[PDB]
Amino acid sequence: AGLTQPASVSGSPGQSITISCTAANSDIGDFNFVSWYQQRPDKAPKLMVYEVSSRPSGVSNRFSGSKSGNTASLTISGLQAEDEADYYCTSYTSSSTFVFGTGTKVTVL
Amino acid sequence: SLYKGVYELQTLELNMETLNMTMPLSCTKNNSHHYIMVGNETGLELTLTNTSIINHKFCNLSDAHKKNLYDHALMSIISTFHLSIPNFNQYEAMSCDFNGGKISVQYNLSHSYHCGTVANGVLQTFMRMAWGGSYIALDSGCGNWDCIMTSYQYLIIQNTTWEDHCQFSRPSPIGYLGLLSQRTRDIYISRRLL
Amino acid sequence: SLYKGVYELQTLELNMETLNMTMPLSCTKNNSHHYIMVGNETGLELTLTNTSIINHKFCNLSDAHKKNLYDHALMSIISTFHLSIPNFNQYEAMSCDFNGGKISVQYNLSHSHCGTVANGVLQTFMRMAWGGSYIALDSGCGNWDCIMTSYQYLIIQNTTWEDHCQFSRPSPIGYLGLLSQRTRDIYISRRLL
Amino acid sequence: SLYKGVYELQTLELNMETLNMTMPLSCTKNNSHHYIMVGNETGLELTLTNTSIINHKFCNLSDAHKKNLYDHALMSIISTFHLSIPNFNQYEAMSCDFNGGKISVQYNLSHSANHCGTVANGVLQTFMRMAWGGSYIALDSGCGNWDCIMTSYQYLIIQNTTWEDHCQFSRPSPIGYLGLLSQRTRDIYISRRLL
Amino acid sequence: GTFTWTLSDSEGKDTPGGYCLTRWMLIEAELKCFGNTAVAKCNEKHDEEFCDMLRLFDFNKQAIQRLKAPAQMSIQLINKAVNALINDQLIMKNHLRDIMCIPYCNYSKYWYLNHTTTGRTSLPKCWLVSNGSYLNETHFSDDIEQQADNMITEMLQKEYM
Amino acid sequence: GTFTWTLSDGGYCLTRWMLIEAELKCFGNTAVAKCNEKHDEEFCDMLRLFDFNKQAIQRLKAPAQMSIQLINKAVNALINDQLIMKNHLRDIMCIPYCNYSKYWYLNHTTTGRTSLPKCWLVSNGSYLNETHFSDDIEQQADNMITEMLQKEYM
Amino acid sequence: GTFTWTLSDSPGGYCLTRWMLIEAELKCFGNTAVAKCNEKHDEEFCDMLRLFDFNKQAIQRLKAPAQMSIQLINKAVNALINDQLIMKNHLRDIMCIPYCNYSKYWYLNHTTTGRTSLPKCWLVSNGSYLNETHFSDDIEQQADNMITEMLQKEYM
Amino acid sequence: QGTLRESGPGLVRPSETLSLTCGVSGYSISSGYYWGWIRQPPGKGLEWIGNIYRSGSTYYNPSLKSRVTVSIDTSKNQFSLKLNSVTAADTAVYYCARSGIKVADDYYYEMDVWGQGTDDYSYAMDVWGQGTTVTVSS
Ligand SMILES: *[C@@H]1O[C@H](CO)[C@@H](O[C@@H]2O[C@H](CO)[C@@H](O[C@@H]3O[C@H](CO[C@H]4O[C@H](CO)[C@@H](O)[C@H](O)[C@@H]4O)[C@@H](O)[C@H](O[C@H]4O[C@H](CO)[C@@H](O)[C@H](O)[C@@H]4O[C@H]4O[C@H](CO)[C@@H](O)[C@H](O)[C@@H]4O)[C@@H]3O)[C@H](O)[C@H]2NC(C)=O)[C@H](O)[C@H]1NC(C)=O
Ligand SMILES: *[C@@H]1O[C@H](CO)[C@@H](O[C@@H]2O[C@H](CO)[C@@H](O[C@@H]3O[C@H](CO[C@H]4O[C@H](CO)[C@@H](O)[C@H](O)[C@@H]4O)[C@@H](O)[C@H](O[C@H]4O[C@H](CO)[C@@H](O)[C@H](O)[C@@H]4O[C@H]4O[C@H](CO)[C@@H](O)[C@H](O)[C@@H]4O)[C@@H]3O)[C@H](O)[C@H]2NC(C)=O)[C@H](O)[C@H]1NC(C)=O
Ligand SMILES: *[C@@H]1O[C@H](CO)[C@@H](O[C@@H]2O[C@H](CO)[C@@H](O[C@@H]3O[C@H](CO[C@H]4O[C@H](CO)[C@@H](O)[C@H](O)[C@@H]4O)[C@@H](O)[C@H](O[C@H]4O[C@H](CO)[C@@H](O)[C@H](O)[C@@H]4O[C@H]4O[C@H](CO)[C@@H](O)[C@H](O)[C@@H]4O)[C@@H]3O)[C@H](O)[C@H]2NC(C)=O)[C@H](O)[C@H]1NC(C)=O
Ligand SMILES: *[C@@H]1O[C@H](CO[C@@H]2O[C@@H](C)[C@@H](O)[C@@H](O)[C@@H]2O)[C@@H](O[C@@H]2O[C@H](CO)[C@@H](O[C@@H]3O[C@H](CO[C@H]4O[C@H](CO)[C@@H](O)[C@H](O)[C@@H]4O)[C@@H](O)[C@H](O[C@H]4O[C@H](CO)[C@@H](O)[C@H](O)[C@@H]4O)[C@@H]3O)[C@H](O)[C@H]2NC(C)=O)[C@H](O)[C@H]1NC(C)=O
Ligand SMILES: *[C@@H]1O[C@H](CO[C@@H]2O[C@@H](C)[C@@H](O)[C@@H](O)[C@@H]2O)[C@@H](O[C@@H]2O[C@H](CO)[C@@H](O[C@@H]3O[C@H](CO[C@H]4O[C@H](CO)[C@@H](O)[C@H](O)[C@@H]4O)[C@@H](O)[C@H](O[C@H]4O[C@H](CO)[C@@H](O)[C@H](O)[C@@H]4O)[C@@H]3O)[C@H](O)[C@H]2NC(C)=O)[C@H](O)[C@H]1NC(C)=O
Ligand SMILES: *[C@@H]1O[C@H](CO[C@@H]2O[C@@H](C)[C@@H](O)[C@@H](O)[C@@H]2O)[C@@H](O[C@@H]2O[C@H](CO)[C@@H](O[C@@H]3O[C@H](CO)[C@@H](O)[C@H](O)[C@@H]3O)[C@H](O)[C@H]2NC(C)=O)[C@H](O)[C@H]1NC(C)=O
Ligand SMILES: *[C@@H]1O[C@H](CO)[C@@H](O[C@@H]2O[C@H](CO)[C@@H](O[C@@H]3O[C@H](CO)[C@@H](O)[C@H](O)[C@@H]3O)[C@H](O)[C@H]2NC(C)=O)[C@H](O)[C@H]1NC(C)=O
Ligand SMILES: *[C@@H]1O[C@H](CO)[C@@H](O[C@@H]2O[C@H](CO)[C@@H](O[C@@H]3O[C@H](CO)[C@@H](O)[C@H](O)[C@@H]3O)[C@H](O)[C@H]2NC(C)=O)[C@H](O)[C@H]1NC(C)=O
Ligand SMILES: *[C@@H]1O[C@H](CO)[C@@H](O[C@@H]2O[C@H](CO)[C@@H](O)[C@H](O)[C@H]2NC(C)=O)[C@H](O)[C@H]1NC(C)=O
Ligand SMILES: *[C@@H]1O[C@H](CO)[C@@H](O[C@@H]2O[C@H](CO)[C@@H](O)[C@H](O)[C@H]2NC(C)=O)[C@H](O)[C@H]1NC(C)=O
Ligand SMILES: *[C@@H]1O[C@H](CO)[C@@H](O[C@@H]2O[C@H](CO)[C@@H](O)[C@H](O)[C@H]2NC(C)=O)[C@H](O)[C@H]1NC(C)=O
Ligand SMILES: *[C@@H]1O[C@H](CO)[C@@H](O[C@@H]2O[C@H](CO)[C@@H](O)[C@H](O)[C@H]2NC(C)=O)[C@H](O)[C@H]1NC(C)=O
Ligand SMILES: *[C@@H]1O[C@H](CO)[C@@H](O[C@@H]2O[C@H](CO)[C@@H](O)[C@H](O)[C@H]2NC(C)=O)[C@H](O)[C@H]1NC(C)=O
Ligand SMILES: *[C@@H]1O[C@H](CO)[C@@H](O)[C@H](O)[C@H]1NC(C)=O
């Protein structure tokens, strides 16, 4: 069906922002290993977070994930202007199927 | 009564709780909840229920083994339980969750649904692990080995704190000690080279 | 034959076929074919032969477990037979096929002569079909570590019940004996088993 | 020494080396080196030491099994030793090497405040039972301690060697190995649902 | 293979060859001592539930008294020692009797014949259960009678010695 | 552990269906009770297996498809597997061994008293001649006579 | 389960040759003592007689491989010895109790008749053999058993 | 390290079959990683098409299960997508991906041949291709 995700999140430079990613209570088994990707304009998605707060090498510590119950979230601490991009959450469904979110448009003010 | 004019009949009842520091002790609380206790501290609660707690089909034992964080006696009990399940072939039936060092194992008895199925093997091992009064939970109660079945949908094994739950039957190591011998007797091969 | 002038020697031969509904019963038909009957319905045929049937290096046990189209008793017999092998360390030596609930296992004995995989397979074959496996072996006795046959393939196939037993009577002794030795000779293939 | 007037006490000691052609025989040279001999040609050296010989986390059992360049008796002894370890869960603590048919296994006993739940105690219990004739001197305390066995040494090294009469401190015996045979896979953990 | 653990000289009130169950090992009961003639059978018979329990209790006592206790209670020792203390196939026999709807011993309650004047006691036999309750002393009456005869038989060899 | 199953039923009787070309054969309590203690009696292990088969078919519900789960758990309580294993060891070492097929017992001609059946050994693909273990048979005869004398001693 | 290996003849009994004993000529034990091994479940010396006899028969009757297999023993051990007796001695060792290490055995020898007892194991506590003063009670008990069986033998 | 590169028709007509080939350079497809296709229609969120493994096993989206095939060719070190019965909704940018998942089915199968694997399963599309645009039009 697809994971619910906010359409837009916003904040000013330096503050923390949080992008949530919520699954339905009828699909808790489909909500596992929630990993988060950044897609800049006209670029391929890049993995920022996998598992919970584990990140690839070269990704700063500003990006950090959390997971609880039917929800997960990505926290961008110390927001900067270069963080503007489309952030997508995806879960690994137990039938071996990636299920993406709807995508969040982060805006820096 | 009195036999042969000189012999009075007398009885004992062993205080089996005193075996707590050396070995596990298993008992039955009521129809749905059964327990095994480890020390005067911890143990596992075996609940037959219609309500699942793990909605996913993952059980990564190796990651739990890497991190430790779990009571080794409890995980030994879990391993003794799982290894003795006869003819276990549907791996998706079992799920578990060891996050933060806890123990939670869920067998989906409704996955395999009359006789000679995975749910019957799980219930056979359950009846031996909780032999002190777990016959009430099973439907027939007797006269059935390969056709053992219960109305409940899931068997849930969760780590708990010690508490005098032994209402229906007295604590006993007998089920666990019996399962130790018959450990790897009925495991199927899944590999040419184990 | 009267012993002590008092006691007459009398013989007693047990009909083991009445144990058909509780346990497997193994027997020998001739040099090449041996059988293990389960129920009055099914069983496995253990054939020593010079001709292969599998002709590939796959044995998808894990897929057969999920499909669950097989006889559980027969697969338990196969599991006991395999896990009773002394020193099985050549995964390419064994192949099988479980298409559609079938059971068809093949052991390649060409990998050879003492202390090899073929000898272990022939030892477990000897114990499983103990009622007349000695005729197939090159030496009936006096040999454990260097048991060898002229046949290159041991082939285990699910079959139907029929009066196969000609050379030896049905007997559960091989299977029941192998149940105790079922896992006591295994090599570690991984640090955390 | 006559008991009840007419019964002399007499002693009997079994020469156990004559069992060399049928079964392994284990002994102790000193507290650091112990041996398990398989016949009159080969065996395994069990050395407790602070010096590591394997400095990698690979062990590669499957490649060794496929190549099949090792002695089968020695690998059977290694498998019995490992499968007798109770509650083995830290696989990084163990490493090994089998290049060219060699056998060289290293258990890192320094992988471990109470020091009672560690994998090192499983390794040391199985080591104590494998070399039961004279392993007790290598431990901190000879007796009165099972769950919390320790030794000052940091590594246990099981490596193939040639036969030689090393049995200085204790006489050779099969009893440790034969006892460990019945305990294989008795107290190991599941690692995967289907096994 | 076969049990080998031998009971310690737990209590000198009786003969040292006997064995006594303290109040801690018994439910709602005082000290109970069984003579050497009863517990001697535990070194030969492979079908006595009570002897297996005696060995378990004695092993527990010795283990908690002699060995250093770890911080968390470890079941490693019993997992190694279980087959030296008890006959696991006796537990299997009781399981088989349970599933087949035969009376069986659950390893809780036992009965023995106590001689009124001498205090001699037989080895306790297990009080069997069936259909969720005890057998009410009548359905296995033939057992007690024969056991009584055994004690009678047992004194006769003591007379003839 | 060791075998624990108790034969249900004095003595014990092998019905016609349990035997190859034979009628009902009953052995008294003196011979059958030997099975309770001895760990090296092939016939006793077979007798326990047949009794277990009878009880299992009578008392437990049968699954529609056959299952060998019950025997896989119950075997060690019925038989001394190391007796089978001794027989296999004597087989490979070219020693006479028991395949558990044929048994012999000494029957008293006038009283009908019978010994516990001892297995008829095989070697080199055929049954041993009687002569080759006549020395064994004589010993069994002596034992029976001794037991008779013991019954007179009481 | 239970051991089943029946030993072999040298009037029955069993004889250990100089290659089986450490600095000793050939020693024989009569059938009256060796026959106890058929039923006794907790005798170390009986397990050792069965191991030695099995070795003697195995190296004679079976075709030897080029290199050792240790496959015959790994399968046959449960029919030769009581492994739980080894576990008993392990338990006695760890608990600071005297235990058998399967090295030295003691038996009483009747001076005029030469009759002997199924040897009992000599125990070790702190890496050294116990003095006979610390288990003289068992020696007296074995002597009493010899007097008892001799009385029953004369009673024949 | 290495790169993934799409290549194929940038234009298909309705009801014909799209065929895209992803070439992998610097990584070995025979390594234990799952090679997959993801889709981004022009302005909408990401949609996972499927993936294939070195064992030949394939996994697909339930919606895109009847129309799609994903194939693997280890000899040339490439994989590929084949989407038949294309329609207007299939106009999108198609991305390669290297994914570090563990499916139990492929785990249990390769145990004897490929032995014990790693445990560093990210369960994420570790590497991505540049992405190729495809328009379904006449
Ligand atoms: C072998 O086979 C036998 C026969 O089947 C089996 O016996 C049964 O064992 C169980 C477990 O001990 C017995 O259950 C106990 O029964 C007593 C008495 O029940 C009567 O009295 C109570 C009074 O409240 C009534 O409610 C009840 O309806 C009966 O009339 C109960 O008192 C026990 O419950 C208490 O003790 C339990 C712990 O032992 C507690 O868990 C429970 O919460 C209760 O607490 C009591 O004690 C507390 C002490 O702190 C106190 O604070 C509480 O207020 C309360 O007083 C328990 O139900 C059952 O009666 C036995 N039945 C028979 C036929 O004998 C063996 O168990 C079995 N053994 C094995 C090893 O399998
Ligand atoms: C323990 O060790 C002993 C000794 O080694 C071993 O004994 C041997 O057992 C086998 C199996 O029973 C015996 O084989 C049987 O022998 C009879 C007689 O064979 C002779 O006569 C025939 C006549 O045609 C000759 O051809 C043959 O060469 C011999 O001279 C056979 O008649 C048996 O075969 C028939 O019955 C079988 C029953 O299973 C059928 O399967 C088979 O197809 C045959 O059927 C025919 O007869 C049936 C009625 O009997 C009838 O119903 C069918 O329709 C058909 O007409 C079989 O070959 C062998 O003789 C024994 N040898 C000795 C020394 O006694 C034990 O078996 C062994 N036990 C274990 C557990 O290992
Ligand atoms: C059960 O438990 C008992 C008691 O704990 C245990 O007994 C001990 O067994 C060991 C092993 O046999 C004994 O160790 C032997 O001791 C003798 C005597 O040692 C003293 O005298 C020598 C004299 O040179 C001193 O060097 C030494 O420091 C002591 O003062 C030694 O002579 C033995 O060494 C020789 O034999 C060994 C075994 O063959 C060889 O490996 C060693 O190299 C020596 O032989 C070589 O050199 C000799 C030099 O003379 C030469 O003669 C030989 O031909 C050869 O070239 C060995 O150290 C220990 O003393 C026993 N302790 C007691 C209390 O009896 C059992 O072993 C144990 N059993 C089991 C199975 O666990
Ligand atoms: C097996 O399942 C394990 C449990 O996973 C749960 O169940 C499954 C079915 C899914 O539902 C999943 O969503 C559930 O969480 C799973 O455990 C996970 O393992 C990973 C990898 O070890 C852990 O990542 C680590 O995270 C910590 C920080 O996270 C903190 O919070 C989480 C909970 O939110 C805690 O669990 C953690 O312990 C932490 O407290 C990182 O610190 C750590 O390493 C970081 O630092 C090192 C320094 O060298 C860096 O190298 C790393 O890159 C990191 O920066 C890991 O990143 C994850 O937290 C953990 N979750 C839980 C709940 O345990 C396991 O991964 C699965 N394994 C397999 C093989 O599938
Ligand atoms: C046992 O299991 C083996 C593994 O099976 C896979 O994993 C398991 C867990 C399941 O998920 C299962 O569904 C998976 O398939 C299995 O081996 C595999 O078998 C399949 C066929 O069943 C093979 O697929 C075929 O591939 C060839 C192309 O591959 C060739 O080249 C490669 C090298 O690049 C070689 O390694 C191959 O051997 C081949 O030479 C396809 O041509 C073929 O048909 C496809 O193409 C035609 C074109 O007309 C289409 O019509 C078909 O629909 C297909 O699209 C298959 O796709 C797979 O390669 C093979 N993998 C391995 C690792 O061997 C084995 O067959 C099973 N054996 C038994 C007896 O059960
Ligand atoms: C093998 O190594 C052990 C342990 O050694 C110590 O731990 C290792 C992991 C390494 O980090 C080593 O560098 C480190 O020394 C040795 O046992 C140890 O022996 C030393 C003395 O040689 C002990 O040092 C004492 O420490 C106390 C601390 O309060 C001081 O008061 C003493 O004055 C003294 O310095 C050390 O405690 C002890 N540790 C253990 C675990 O027993 C062992 O001797 C060594 N063996 C050999 C021969 O290599
Ligand atoms: C679990 O098992 C242990 C060991 O059997 C039990 O401990 C024992 O508890 C009894 C009753 O409290 C103690 O009896 C008394 O102990 C005190 C303190 O030592 C003593 O002063 C009295 O004279 C009397 O002996 C017994 O000593 C004690 N033993 C040990 C070693 O702790 C415990 O009670 C059991 N707990 C459960 C869950 O039943
Ligand atoms: C435990 O196992 C049972 C049986 O496998 C699981 O129940 C099954 O759940 C799945 C997913 O919901 C069902 O699939 C769908 O079910 C609906 C029911 O109307 C059907 O319309 C769909 O076509 C599809 O089949 C499946 O039918 C259902 N089976 C049964 C017998 O209930 C259950 O979800 C498992 N629970 C856990 C926690 O794993
Ligand atoms: C099951 O075990 C877990 C893990 O030990 C218990 O949760 C821990 O409880 C301790 C108590 O001291 C805390 O310090 C830990 O932080 C807890 N861990 C986590 C991850 O929450 C849990 O309480 C046990 N279950 C029950 C019912 O007692
Ligand atoms: C059974 O094993 C034998 C021995 O490995 C196989 O025969 C060999 O196969 C290889 C590889 O094709 C050839 O190079 C050899 O020349 C063959 N040797 C002989 C003596 O024929 C045989 O193919 C295997 N059988 C099966 C069915 O896999
Ligand atoms: C199966 O084939 C093998 C050869 O691959 C046959 O055995 C060999 O036959 C040759 C030629 O006759 C002899 O020189 C060898 O001595 C034989 N080897 C052995 C080990 O016996 C074998 O006979 C064939 N099997 C059958 C049943 O015909
Ligand atoms: C071996 O087993 C297979 C699989 O069970 C048997 O073939 C099946 O036979 C049944 C008979 O009712 C059919 O319903 C199935 O459709 C068959 N399955 C397949 C895949 O063909 C086969 O007959 C057995 N072998 C023998 C020799 O009887
Ligand atoms: C451990 O075993 C290895 C392998 O057998 C031994 O090294 C071999 O020694 C023989 C001696 O004839 C050489 O022919 C081989 O080439 C050696 N193999 C390799 C790979 O070098 C080694 O000596 C043994 N270890 C000890 C200490 O003796
Ligand atoms: C006892 O038997 C009666 C019938 O006589 C039955 O109603 C009852 O449920 C049985 N109890 C148990 C615990 O099985």
- Show me where the domains of chain H are located: 3-133
Taking CB atoms and an 8 Å limit, are D147 and E70 in contact across chains?
Answer: yes
Task: Enumerate the domain spans of chain G.
Answer: 14-155
Residues making up chain C, counted from first to last: 193
Taking CB atoms and an 8 Å limit, are B91 and H108 in contact across chains?
Answer: yes
CB count within 10 Å of CB E97 equals 20
Give G145-154 contacts, CB < 8 A, sequence gap 24+.
G145/G117, G146/D7, G146/G108, G146/G110, G146/G115, G146/G117, G147/D4, G149/G32, G150/G115
**Residue A68, exposed/middle/buried by CB under 10 A (0-12, 13-18, 19+)?**
exposed
- What span, in angstroms and rounded, lies between the C-alpha atoms of G49 and G55? 10
The C-alpha of D183 sits at a distance from chain H's nearest C-alpha, in angstroms, of 25
Q: Among C68, C82, C179, select the one facing B189 at the smallest CB separation.
A: C82
E runs forming strands in chain C: 2-3, 7-13, 25-28, 33-38, 42-49, 94-97, 104-108, 153-160
- Count the alpha carbons within 13 Å of E131 in the hemisphere toward its beta carbon: 3
Mutate which of E131, E133, E134, E135 for ligand 14? The one with the most ligand atoms within 8 Å of its CB, which is E131
Query: Which ligand is closest to the CA of D50, given by its number?
Result: 6
Domain assignment of residue C43, yes or no: yes
- What span, in angstroms and rounded, lies between the C-alpha atoms of C65 and D193? 12
Using an 8 Å Cβ cutoff, are G70 and D73 in contact? yes
Using an 8 Å Cβ cutoff, are D142 and D22 in contact? no
- What span, in angstroms and rounded, lies between the C-alpha atoms of C134 and C136? 5
Using an 8 Å Cβ cutoff, are D7 and G148 in contact? no
Q: Is the dihedral of CA H110, H116, H117, H119 positive or negative?
A: positive
Domain count within chain B: 1
Domain assignment of residue B133, yes or no: yes
What's the token pair of residue C72? 């559980």
Cβ of C163 less than 6 Å from ligand 2:
yes
Nearest ligand 7 atom to the CA of E60 is 5
CA of residue B166 to ligand 1 center, whole Å: 7
Query: Which ligand is closest to the CA of G98, given by its number?
Result: 3
Beta bridge partners of G104: D13
Using an 8 Å Cβ cutoff, are E122 and E103 in contact? no
Angle at E38 between CA E32 and CA E40, to 5 degrees: 125
Nearest ligand 5 atom to the CA of H109 is 9
Write the Ramachandran bin of E61: left for phi over 0, alpha for psi from -120 to 50, otherwise beta. Answer: alpha
Closest among G2, G5, G155, G1 to G80, alpha carbons compared? G5
Domain assignment of residue D42, yes or no: yes
Cβ of C60 less than 6 Å from ligand 5:
yes
State the method. Answer: cryo-EM
Domain assignment of residue B7, yes or no: no
User: For residue D184, what is the nearest residue in chain G, using CA coordinates?
Assistant: G74
What's the token pair of residue A22? 């919520």
Mutate which of B169, B176, B177 for ligand 1? The one with the most ligand atoms within 8 Å of its CB, which is B169
B4 touches chain H (CB under 8 A): no
Taking CB atoms and an 8 Å limit, are B63 and H111 in contact across chains?
Answer: no
Report which secondary-structure segment, H or E, holds F144: helix F134-153
The answer, yes or no, to whether B and E have at least 3 beta-carbon pairs within 8 Å is yes
Q: Is the dihedral of CA C182, C183, C187, C193 positive or negative?
A: positive
Cβ of E69 less than 6 Å from ligand 7:
no
Give E130-137 contacts, CB < 8 A, sequence gap 24+.
E130/E101, E130/E102, E130/E103, E130/E104, E132/B135, E132/B136, E134/E109, E135/E103, E137/B1, E137/B9
What's the token pair of residue H16? 């014909």
C183 touches chain F (CB under 8 A): no
G131 touches chain F (CB under 8 A): no
Q: What is Dmax (Cα atoms) for chain B?
A: 68
Of all protein residues, the one whose alpha carbon is nearest to atom 1 of ligand 4 is B60
Show residues of chain A in contact with B58, CB under 8 Å.
32, 94
CA of residue C38 to ligand 12 center, whole Å: 15
- What span, in angstroms and rounded, lies between the C-alpha atoms of D155 and D139? 13
Q: Give CA separation, F28 vs E59, F10, F38, F51, H57, in Å.
A: 40, 6, 17, 16, 66
Closest among H62, H18, H60, H38 to H124, alpha carbons compared? H38
Beta bridge partners of E121: E114
Place of tokens 């604590």: B171
Coil vs helix vs strand at F68: coil
The C-alpha of F40 sits at a distance from chain G's nearest C-alpha, in angstroms, of 6
CA of residue C29 to ligand 2 center, whole Å: 10
Angle at E129 between CA E126 and CA E132, to 5 degrees: 155
Phi, psi for residue F15 in degrees, rounded to 5? -75, 170
Phi, psi for residue F117 in degrees, rounded to 5? -60, 130
Mutate which of B159, B161, B162 for ligand 9? The one with the most ligand atoms within 8 Å of its CB, which is B159
Count Cβ–Cβ pairs < 8 Å, chain B vs chain C. 51
Angle at C144 between CA C140 and CA C147, to 5 degrees: 65
Beta bridge partners of A91: A99
Place of tokens 């006579």: F145
Please enumerate in sequence order all residues whose Cβ is within 8 A of that of E143, keeping only pairs 6 or more positions apart, or say none.
E125
In chain A, what are the domains? 8-108 (2.60.40.10)
Using an 8 Å Cβ cutoff, are E41 and E54 in contact? no
Closest among H38, E39, C126, D147 to F87, alpha carbons compared? C126
Cβ of C134 less than 6 Å from ligand 2:
no
Show residues of chain E in contact with F36, CB under 8 Å.
47
Coil vs helix vs strand at E55: helix
Query: Which ligand is closest to the CA of C138, given by its number?
Result: 11
Using an 8 Å Cβ cutoff, are F124 and C139 in contact? no
Domain assignment of residue B192, yes or no: no
Q: Which residue, among G3, G4, G53, G155, would best test binding to F if mutated, counting the most F CBs under 10 Å from its CB?
A: G4
Closest among G71, G43, G52, G74 to G8, alpha carbons compared? G52
> Which structural domain, as residue segments, surrounds residue B91?
25-53+62-105+115-181
- Between helix C173-180 and helix F81-92 the angle, nearest 10°, is 110
Cβ of B132 less than 6 Å from ligand 1:
yes
Closest among H37, H44, H131, H136 to H86, alpha carbons compared? H136
CATH superfamily of H3-133: Immunoglobulins (2.60.40.10)
What's the token pair of residue D172? 């050779």
Angle at C62 between CA C57 and CA C63, to 5 degrees: 85
**Amino acid letter at E120?**
R
Using an 8 Å Cβ cutoff, are D39 and D21 in contact? yes
Q: Give CA separation, B59 vs B92, B108, D191, G42, H110, in Å.
A: 9, 13, 10, 45, 18
The C-alpha of F41 sits at a distance from chain G's nearest C-alpha, in angstroms, of 10
Of all protein residues, the one whose alpha carbon is nearest to atom 54 of ligand 4 is A54
Q: Which residue, among H106, H114, H116, would best test binding to D if mutated, counting the most D CBs under 10 Å from its CB?
A: H116
Nearest ligand 12 atom to the CA of C160 is 28
Give F144-150 contacts, CB < 8 A, sequence gap 24+.
F144/C7, F144/F106, F144/F108, F144/F113, F144/F115, F145/C4, F145/C6, F147/F30, F148/F113
Of all protein residues, the one whose alpha carbon is nearest to atom 11 of ligand 12 is C160
- Count the alpha carbons within 13 Å of C27 in the hemisphere toward its beta carbon: 20
- What span, in angstroms and rounded, lies between the C-alpha atoms of G20 and D18? 7
CA of residue D102 to ligand 13 center, whole Å: 7
**Residue E90, exposed/middle/buried by CB under 10 A (0-12, 13-18, 19+)?**
buried
**What resolution does the deposited structure have, in angstroms?**
3.0
C 7-66 residues inside an 8 A Cβ radius of B:
59, 61-62, 65-66
Using an 8 Å Cβ cutoff, are D60 and D104 in contact? no
Show residues of chain E in contact with D182, CB under 8 Å.
1
CA of residue H55 to ligand 5 center, whole Å: 7
Strand order in the sheet with D42-49: D25-28, D33-38, D42-49, D155-162, D104-108, D94-97
Mutate which of C110, C117, C121, C150 for ligand 10? The one with the most ligand atoms within 8 Å of its CB, which is C110
User: For residue D194, what is the nearest residue in chain C, using CA coordinates?
Assistant: C62
The subunits that touch chain C, with at least 3 C-beta pairs less than 8 Å apart, are B, D, F, G, H
Taking CB atoms and an 8 Å limit, are B187 and C79 in contact across chains?
Answer: yes
